[PDB]
């Protein structure tokens, strides 16, 4: 039970790291949010 501070770029780089670490529906929606947030 802890919380800390964070910026958006850390969140995006960590979204990248989580796309990388554990490898159907979940990562599909994650690619969806990745394509929506960027661009």
């Amino acid at each position: 039970r802890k919380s800390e501070k964070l910026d958006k770029d850390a969140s995006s780089k960590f979204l990248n790291r989580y796309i990388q670490t554990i490898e159907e529906s979940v990562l599909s929606q994650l690619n969806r949010v990745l394509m929506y947030l960027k661009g």
């Binding site: 919380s3 964070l6 554990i22 979940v26 929506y36």
Partner: protein, 160 residues
Amino acid sequence: DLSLYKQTVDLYLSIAPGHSRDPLNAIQEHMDSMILSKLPRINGIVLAYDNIRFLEKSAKVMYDSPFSFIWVRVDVLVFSPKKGDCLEGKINLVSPSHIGLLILGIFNASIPRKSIPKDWIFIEPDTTEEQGRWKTNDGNILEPGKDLEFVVDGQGTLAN
């Protein structure tokens, strides 16, 4: 806004007995269930996690059961739409009862006509009775402009 967040949380994971050789497998086994699922402590949907390390305290065995327990530090990526500020989404359904959007392609937005002011009028096409364009008081069509921006209540609001 910057509605995406990542928070390093600490949880109390129950390592099943079948995986007492390596804990990592039994940790992943129930971490990969929480993904895309509402983790209510942080009040959001978990999207990402990495750096799977356990505070080494020789995970404790429940006093009558074979599955162990341990505190594990993992970093979640909950999306928090807690009425922070303006957001934006693509419309899929439109009706003179509410407007339907998808933000990030995932999360639903049902903006009723209550939070919409009267000044925008809906035209009912001859091909589909329900589906049609919700024209604004200016006269602009929103179907080509899929991107609709608003502010949130908790649900959206188009009234200023």
